[model samples]
Target: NSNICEVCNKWGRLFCCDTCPRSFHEHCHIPSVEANKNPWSCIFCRIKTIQERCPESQSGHQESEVLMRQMLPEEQLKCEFLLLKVYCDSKSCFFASEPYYNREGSQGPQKPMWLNKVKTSLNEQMYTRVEGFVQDMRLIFHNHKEFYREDKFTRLGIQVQDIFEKNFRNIFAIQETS
Candidate 1:
């Protein structure tokens, strides 16, 4: 609370983002702001626009000319977290190959899964958000809850889901209320 920084949860002078509804301590949003640079956007707003990912290469039908909106590091982490959660949940019931396998007949998907996004492309906000999320998740992972008798990995995955839901309630709160 008051003792800790809003962004990174350390002690320092906190600054609010003008564009979005998040705050950060100066240290949390570092390279440190100067006396000028007033009315500056937090990294959230800077990197929040749509971006065309792939380039037009001379291939059949320009398959590489893909228009894609990139994910914020936090959002990306959330997705990966969900991916891991699905794996954990299904592992007990399905074989390792079953996720990619189609039960009705053929193998799933023509293109490879969406894992091509590079890490270095992420800006400061995304990286910081993901870093914090991972830290929080690591904490949750270490001391996850147990139901019935034993500590199920699926239950641990559920705990991560809960963490994601609780922290990110803002994303869906408006829709739910409306």
Candidate 2:
């Protein structure tokens, strides 16, 4: 295992996430950390997944808002990797919802639901239908188990139900726990 390439299993630095027990070499991996501080982003970015998705806009609502959270500092600093999760309203939303203009501020949202509070108006970007109002996201961690301590399941229950009500179309729900 040590000799094998940690990333593609072809070569070896063998870069691996702190949370991920799996090993990958630096050369074969994406977001290969050049320093100890910067967080590494994987090719699939297991950090983000399609827990929910909506192609069409629902009536009354200008934009779809997904409620989620960001990973805590401790969680982000992982080398023993697990499943990575990232939520972005732009997953299917689009590159830019506006016309040509200022490109200074938009660096893509950190999370799918939360937008920069500083941004007062996104007039031209509003060209498309997605107003993008998703908010309150929390990146949770699990060892891939079925039963939660109760609180986790409780919140997910509430969120999942609301997601369905928002639109007849199902959202990206990926839960392996039975």
Candidate 3:
């Protein structure tokens, strides 16, 4: 929005470029752009486009779609952990397998070896290995009362966003100047 048009210098509705600190009144744009869109670039800027990410898409194949790449290593691990923990919760095993101890032994060692299962295999091998681990955890930790479940894959889903903030510190923040 603009308090004064960058073009005609009259106050009115405007479109803002999210990528830049620039703004222009609706009618001020060279092509007369509209307001409130996914991309609202001014004429002085480069290209403007809205995207429906392909690889993240749930729909069938499309010709012009560009596939999104996999998450970064740490992010992938965090996501995998969250999904597993959520599955464990649904089966009454999340608390049962909690790992309270750190390498420094700050709080002493904790229950079940579940975390090690994911941590050790968090590389390019994770997609299948971690998935298989979750699938067969019941058989893997059969003696542990709350560890086993016939329907481990049936999850209520984890709260991914809050889980990151509440448990993890910010070794993962992406600091971008632009």
> Local error of candidate 3 at 137, Å?
5.3
Q: How far does residue 11 in candidate 2 sit from its true spot (Å)?
A: 4.5
Quote the lDDT for 61 in model 1.
28
Kindly give the number of clashing pairs for every candidate: 0, 39, 0
TM values, all candidates:
0.29, 0.23, 0.23
Note the Cα lDDT for every prediction shown: 0.37, 0.29, 0.38
Give the alpha carbon lDDT tens digit for every residue of 35-136 in model 2. Answer: 563455443444233111323322232122322323332222211121111211122111112212223433323332221210111212321212121212
Q: How much is the lDDT of residue 126 in candidate 1?
A: 44
- Best model per lDDT: 3
Among all windows of 10 consecutive residues in model 2, the one with the lowest summed lDDT is 137-146
- What does the lDDT read for residue 4 in candidate 2? 54
Cα-based lDDT at residue 165, candidate 1: 47
Error of 2 at 140 (Å): 37
